[PDB]
Design an enzyme around this catalytic site. Structure first.
Site, PDB file in Angstrom:
ATOM      1  N   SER A 236     -10.329   3.335  -5.960  1.00 40.52           N
ATOM      2  CA  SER A 236     -10.914   4.025  -4.815  1.00 40.52           C
ATOM      3  C   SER A 236     -11.865   5.143  -5.251  1.00 40.52           C
ATOM      4  CB  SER A 236      -9.812   4.569  -3.905  1.00 40.52           C
ATOM      5  OG  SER A 236      -8.975   3.516  -3.457  1.00 40.52           O
TER       6      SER A 236
ATOM      7  N   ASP B 202     -12.543   4.330   4.770  1.00 44.90           N
ATOM      8  CA  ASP B 202     -11.483   3.452   5.261  1.00 44.90           C
ATOM      9  C   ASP B 202     -11.922   2.758   6.538  1.00 44.90           C
ATOM     10  OD1 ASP B 202     -10.001   4.585   3.214  1.00 44.90           O
ATOM     11  OD2 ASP B 202      -8.525   5.518   4.542  1.00 44.90           O
TER      12      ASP B 202
ATOM     13  N   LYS C 179      -3.751  -0.994  -6.680  1.00 50.05           N
ATOM     14  CA  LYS C 179      -4.742  -0.193  -5.971  1.00 50.05           C
ATOM     15  C   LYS C 179      -4.457   1.266  -6.290  1.00 50.05           C
ATOM     16  CE  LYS C 179      -6.256   1.128  -1.283  1.00 50.05           C
ATOM     17  NZ  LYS C 179      -6.095   0.783   0.157  1.00 50.05           N
TER      18      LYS C 179
ATOM     19  N   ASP D  31      -5.454   4.944  -5.392  1.00 48.06           N
ATOM     20  CA  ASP D  31      -6.076   5.889  -4.480  1.00 48.06           C
ATOM     21  C   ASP D  31      -6.368   7.203  -5.208  1.00 48.06           C
ATOM     22  OD1 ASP D  31      -7.042   5.979  -1.887  1.00 48.06           O
ATOM     23  OD2 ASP D  31      -5.062   5.706  -0.978  1.00 48.06           O
TER      24      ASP D  31
ATOM     25  N   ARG E 288     -13.394   0.516  -3.891  1.00 55.39           N
ATOM     26  CA  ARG E 288     -13.705   0.923  -2.533  1.00 55.39           C
ATOM     27  C   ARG E 288     -14.850   1.938  -2.570  1.00 55.39           C
ATOM     28  NH1 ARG E 288     -10.069   1.838   1.268  1.00 55.39           N
ATOM     29  NH2 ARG E 288     -11.859   3.061   2.035  1.00 55.39           N
TER      30      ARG E 288
ATOM     31  N   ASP F 275       0.849  -1.191   0.000  1.00 54.28           N
ATOM     32  CA  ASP F 275       0.000   0.000   0.000  1.00 54.28           C
ATOM     33  C   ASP F 275       0.890   1.249   0.000  1.00 54.28           C
ATOM     34  OD1 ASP F 275      -2.284   1.979   1.282  1.00 54.28           O
ATOM     35  OD2 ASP F 275      -3.218   0.210   0.394  1.00 54.28           O
ATOM     36  N   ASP F 276       0.401   2.335   0.594  1.00 52.85           N
ATOM     37  CA  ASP F 276       1.099   3.619   0.606  1.00 52.85           C
ATOM     38  C   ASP F 276       2.474   3.563   1.296  1.00 52.85           C
ATOM     39  OD1 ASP F 276       1.566   6.328   0.189  1.00 52.85           O
ATOM     40  OD2 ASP F 276      -0.337   6.980   1.070  1.00 52.85           O
TER      41      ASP F 276
END
Ligand SMILES: *[C@@H]1O[C@H](CO)[C@@H](O[C@@H]2O[C@H](CO)[C@@H](O[C@@H]3O[C@H](CO[C@H]4O[C@H](CO)[C@@H](O)[C@H](O)[C@@H]4O)[C@@H](O)[C@H](O[C@H]4O[C@H](CO)[C@@H](O)[C@H](O)[C@@H]4O)[C@@H]3O)[C@H](O)[C@H]2NC(C)=O)[C@H](O)[C@H]1NC(C)=O
Ligand SMILES: *[C@@H]1O[C@H](CO)[C@@H](O[C@@H]2O[C@H](CO)[C@@H](O[C@@H]3O[C@H](CO[C@H]4O[C@H](CO)[C@@H](O)[C@H](O)[C@@H]4O)[C@@H](O)[C@H](O[C@H]4O[C@H](CO)[C@@H](O)[C@H](O)[C@@H]4O)[C@@H]3O)[C@H](O)[C@H]2NC(C)=O)[C@H](O)[C@H]1NC(C)=O
Ligand SMILES: *[C@@H]1O[C@H](CO[C@@H]2O[C@@H](C)[C@@H](O)[C@@H](O)[C@@H]2O)[C@@H](O[C@@H]2O[C@H](CO)[C@@H](O[C@@H]3O[C@H](CO)[C@@H](O)[C@H](O)[C@@H]3O)[C@H](O)[C@H]2NC(C)=O)[C@H](O)[C@H]1NC(C)=O
Ligand SMILES: *[C@@H]1O[C@H](CO[C@@H]2O[C@@H](C)[C@@H](O)[C@@H](O)[C@@H]2O)[C@@H](O[C@@H]2O[C@H](CO)[C@@H](O)[C@H](O)[C@H]2NC(C)=O)[C@H](O)[C@H]1NC(C)=O
Ligand SMILES: *[C@@H]1O[C@H](CO)[C@@H](O)[C@H](O)[C@H]1NC(C)=O
Ligand SMILES: *[C@@H]1O[C@H](CO)[C@@H](O)[C@H](O)[C@H]1NC(C)=O
Lengths: 387, 387
Positions: free
Chosen positions: B171, B200, B137, B139, B196, B61-62
C-alpha cells in the site's frame, strides 16, 4: 393553486428522463418521442396495474412541437404525431388516464422548439384546453426573469379562463435559484399546483443525493409551503432505469414519499423488471405518499454514523419514518428508540416495515429497537398508536 | 517483484470491502471476521466455479489479530479463529486455493490492531511463511514516510529470506500520493507484486469514477510500470454489493480488465445473484484480464458526447476495446470506425462482444460501426485479425 386539483401529489409517467429529445424515428422507432410511444405507455399503464395503483397522468415533455400554423396556433410534429394531440388525449381518456403536455415560457423550449412567448400565452392555453389536456408543465428557458414574473401568473389565469381544470406544473423557481428573496413561495402556491425548485434529475445516485441535500439544507423554507394543491417537485423517479442500484431505487421511492413529492415515473414500462414494478406499486408506500393531510416530511436526525432519519406526519396520528444510510461500507445496525426520535410519551406504537411487510408491535418511547440498513439504502416504517 | 508469482494479475476474494472490521460474532456470527467466514467462502470458491475460473486467492484483511504472545509472535483472535491460522491455511490449500493475510507497516493496523513495526518485520514474515500463507497485503497506517521507505523493502527482503513464495501487495504508494517524485515506481516494481496506488474504494459509483479519473489523468506514468509480476492495484471489485447498478457492475469489471487490474472480489459469495456471478465468471473477460503479455490498457479517446474509449493490447495481435458512457440520460448510439481509433494497415478484423457474445465480422479500418451504450455502462469488444 386553488383549482381543486392535486389535493394529493400527482402520480404518473413523464417522457423526459428516459426518452429525452430522441426524434430519430427512422433509426429508433420504438424509443423516439412519438404518438406511438405515448399510446404504448398508456396501454401499459392501463393493463399493468399502474392506473389502478394511482398512476393516472401520462405526460408529454419537450420535443413534441412541429410549429405554428397561419393563425399562430401550436401544432405537434406531423410526422411523429400524425393524428394530432386531441387523438392522443381521447385515447388516454378512453383508458381512464389523463394527458399532460409541455410548453416553455420564453422564445424557445429548452431543446429549441417553438416557445410560448407572452403574446402566445392565452392562445396556447386555449389550444391546450380545446385539445382536452389535463396538465401542463411550463418550462422557462430562453426568457428573462421579468418575462417569467409576468408569464407564469398570466398562464395560470389563462388556463383558468378556459374553464377546463388543468393541473399546472411550473419550473419558474428553478431558474431563479429556488430560494428567497428571489423566489416567493406564497405567490407560487397561489399560481401553481407544483413547482420544480431545483436541478433536473439525471440517471445517477449522485444526482439523487444532490437534490436531497438541497431539499434538506433548505427544509425550514420548503417544508411548510407544501400542501394539498401546491407541492414541491424534486423531479422524476429514476426507478427502472440505469443509474440506480436496488437499494438506491428503494431509497428514492421512500424519500420522495416522505417529502410529499410527485411520483412521476420516467422509465420504459414495456420492459420494467418485476423488482422495480414492486417498488413503484407498493400499496403502503403509495398510501403514505397520497396521505390526505399533505404534510411534507423533514429530516429529523443526522448521526455521525451517517445514518439519517426522516419523519413525515400522516392522518390518524400515524407517521412515516425513513432510516437512511449514507454509508458506503456495509449493512449497519442502527440502534434507537422512539423517545430519541422525539415522539410523545405514554403512547404505545406499532410499526409496519413498508418494504418487508413485517410488523413491530408494542413500541413505547423507551423501547430500544434495531434496524439493519444497507449502504445507500433505507428502512421505512409506517408507525401508528395502538389501543 | 521477481519471485515467480503473479505473472498475470491475482484473482480472488478479499474480506475488507464487504465485511470490513465486523468483530461482533455474538450478534452477527454469519458476517463477522472469523475462521468460519473464510472457510465458508473457500467452500463457495471451490464449489461454485470461482477457483476453476481462476479465482484462487482467499485473503484476510484487517481485524484478524488477537495479539502477540510472550515471544512477540502474532496470534489470531482466539475466539474468532479458534483453530489457528495454520489450520485455516491447510483447509484453504486442500480446496486448491491460496491464503492471503494482512499486516501493517507501522505501530498499528488502520483499525488499531497490533502493527508490524520495523523490529517485527522479520519475525512476522517468518510467522507467515511457517503458517504457509501465500500472499501478504502490507498496509501503511500509523507510520512515517521514513519508516515506510525502510519497512517495505525490509519486508520484501524478509519474505524472500523465508524461502516461501509469498505474493506481496504493497500500500506504500497510496500514502505518498501515488506519483513521482515521492513514489519511485522502478523500486516498487522490484520489491512488490502489486501496489495500491490510490484511495480505498467504497461501495459507490462515485468511488469507482474517482479512481478511474485518477488512473486516467496519470496513465502516462502508470501504464508503463505494470506487467507480469508487478501490477497497479485500483482496489477491490464492488460487483455483488449495494452501490453499483447492473450497468455499473459490468462497467467496473470491463474497466478493471482493460487496466490489467487484480480481480479481487469482496462480496458475500453465499448469496451472490446469478446475474452478478455471470459478470465475474465471464470466460472471455477473464482471458483478457489474464492475458500473458500483461500490458495495461489506456483511455485512447474522449468525446464531447461523454463516450470514452479504452484499449488494451493483447497476445496474438488481439485487442480489447471498452466503449464507456459517462452520460446520465439514456442509451447512446456511438458511431465510429477502427481507423478513427488509431488502427492502421489493411488488416481486416472481427470482434466478439464480451457480454452478449455476438460476433461482428468484416471490420476494416474505414468500416463505420455503431454500438449502443447505456448510461454509466459499457460495450466491450475482443478484437482480432481474421485470415
Ligand atoms: C378558476 O379559479 C377559481 C377561483 O380561484 C376557482 O374557483 C375555486 O375553486 C375552488 C376548488 O373547487 C373552491 O374551493 C372550495 O370552496 C368550497 C366552498 O366554498 C364556498 O364558500 C366560500 C366562503 O367560505 C366562498 O369563498 C366560495 O365562493 C364558496 O361559495 C369549499 O367547501 C371547498 O372546501 C374544500 O377544502 C376543505 C378544507 O381544505 C375540505 O374540508 C373540503 O373537503 C373541500 O375539499 C373548497 O375550498 C373555491 O371556492 C373557488 N373559488 C371561487 C372564487 O369560485 C376555479 O375552480 C378555477 N377554475 C378552473 C377551471 O381552473
Ligand atoms: C528471492 O529473490 C530472488 C531474486 O533476487 C528470486 O530468484 C528469482 O526467482 C525467479 C522465479 O523462480 C527466477 O525466474 C525464473 O528463472 C528460471 C530460469 O532462468 C534462469 O536462466 C536465465 C538465463 O537467461 C537467467 O537469466 C536467470 O537468472 C535464471 O538463472 C525460468 O525457468 C523461469 O521461467 C518461468 O516463466 C516461464 C514463462 O516465461 C515459464 O515457461 C516457466 O515455466 C517458468 O515458470 C523464471 O523466469 C529468477 O531467475 C530468480 N532470479 C535470480 C537472480 O536468481 C527468488 O525467487 C526470491 N525468493 C523468494 C522465496 O521470494
Ligand atoms: C426573444 O426573441 C426576441 C424576438 O426575436 C426573434 O428571436 C431572435 C432570437 C432572432 O432570431 C430574431 O430574428 C427573431 O425575430 C428577441 O428580440 C430580438 O432579438 C434580436 C436578436 O438578438 C435583436 O436583433 C439584434 O439587435 C441588436 C441591436 O441593434 C444587434 O446588435 C444584433 O445584430 C441584432 O440585429 C432584436 O432587436 C430583438 N427584437 C426586439 C423586438 O426586441 C429577444 O432577444 C429574445 N429574448 C431572449 C431573452 O432570448
Ligand atoms: C509510533 O509509536 C512510537 C512509539 O511511542 C508510542 O507512541 C507515543 C506517542 C506514546 O504513546 C508512547 O507511549 C508509545 O510508546 C512513536 O514514537 C514516539 O513519538 C512521540 C511523539 O508523539 C515522541 O514523544 C516519542 O519520543 C517517541 N517514542 C519513541 C520511543 O520513539 C511514534 O510517533 C509513532 N508513530 C506514529 C506516526 O504514529
Ligand atoms: C436502551 O439500551 C441502552 C443501552 O445502550 C440502555 O442504557 C437503556 O437502558 C435502554 N433503554 C431502556 C430504558 O430500555
Ligand atoms: C462513414 O460514415 C460517415 C458519416 O457518418 C461518412 O461520411 C463516410 O463516408 C462513411 N464511410 C464509409 C467507409 O462508409
Amino acid at each position: 393553486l386553488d383549482n381543486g386539483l392535486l389535493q394529493t401529489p400527482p402520480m404518473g409517467w413523464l417522457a423526459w428522463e428516459r426518452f429525452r429529445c430522441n426524434i430519430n424515428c427512422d433509426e429508433d422507432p420504438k424509443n423516439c418521442i412519438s404518438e406511438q410511444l405515448f399510446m404504448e405507455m398508456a396501454d401499459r399503464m392501463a393493463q399493468d396495474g399502474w392506473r389502478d395503483m394511482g398512476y393516472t397522468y401520462l405526460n408529454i415533455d419537450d420535443c413534441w412541437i412541429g410549429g405554428r400554423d397561419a393563425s399562430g396556433r401550436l401544432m405537434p410534429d406531423p410526422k411523429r404525431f400524425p393524428h394530432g394531440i386531441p387523438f392522443l388525449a381521447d385515447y388516454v381518456h378512453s383508458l381512464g388516464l389523463k394527458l399532460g403536455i409541455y410548453a416553455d415560457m420564453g422564445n424557445f423550449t429548452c431543446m429549441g422548439y417553438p416557445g410560448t412567448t407572452l403574446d402566445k400565452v392565452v392562445q396556447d392555453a386555449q389550444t391546450f384546453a380545446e385539445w382536452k389536456v389535463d396538465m401542463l408543465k411550463l418550462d422557462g428557458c430562453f426568457s428573462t426573469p421579468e418575462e417569467r414574473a409576468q408569464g407564469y401568473p398570466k398562464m395560470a389565469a389563462a388556463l383558468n379562463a378556459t374553464g377546463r381544470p388543468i393541473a399546472f406544473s411550473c419550473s419558474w423557481p428553478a431558474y431563479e435559484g429556488g430560494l428567497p428573496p428571489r423566489v416567493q413561495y406564497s405567490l407560487l402556491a397561489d399560481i401553481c399546483n407544483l413547482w420544480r425548485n431545483y436541478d433536473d434529475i439525471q440517471d445517477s445516485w449522485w444526482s439523487v443525493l444532490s437534490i436531497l441535500n438541497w431539499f434538506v439544507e433548505h427544509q425550514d423554507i420548503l417544508q411548510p409551503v407544501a400542501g394539498p394543491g401546491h407541492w414541491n417537485d424534486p423531479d422524476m423517479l429514476l426507478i427502472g432505469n440505469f443509474g440506480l442500484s436496488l437499494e438506491q431505487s428503494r431509497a428514492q421511492m421512500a424519500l420522495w414519499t416522505v417529502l410529499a413529492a410527485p411520483l412521476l415515473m420516467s422509465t420504459d414500462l414495456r420492459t420494467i423488471s418485476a423488482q422495480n414494478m414492486d417498488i413503484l406499486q407498493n400499496p403502503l408506500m403509495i398510501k403514505i405518499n397520497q396521505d390526505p393531510l399533505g404534510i411534507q416530511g423533514r429530516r429529523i436526525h443526522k448521526e455521525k454514523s451517517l445514518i439519517e432519519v426522516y419523519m413525515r406526519p400522516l392522518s390518524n396520528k400515524a407517521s412515516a419514518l425513513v432510516f437512511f444510510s449514507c454509508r458506503t461500507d456495509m449493512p449497519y445496525r442502527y440502534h434507537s428508540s422512539l423517545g430519541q426520535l422525539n415522539f410523545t410519551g405514554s403512547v404505545i406504537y406499532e410499526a409496519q416495515d413498508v418494504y418487508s411487510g413485517d410488523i413491530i408491535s408494542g413500541l413505547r418511547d423507551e423501547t430500544n429497537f434495531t434496524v439493519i440498513i444497507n449502504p445507500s439504502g433505507v428502512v421505512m416504517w409506517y408507525l401508528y398508536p395502538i389501543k
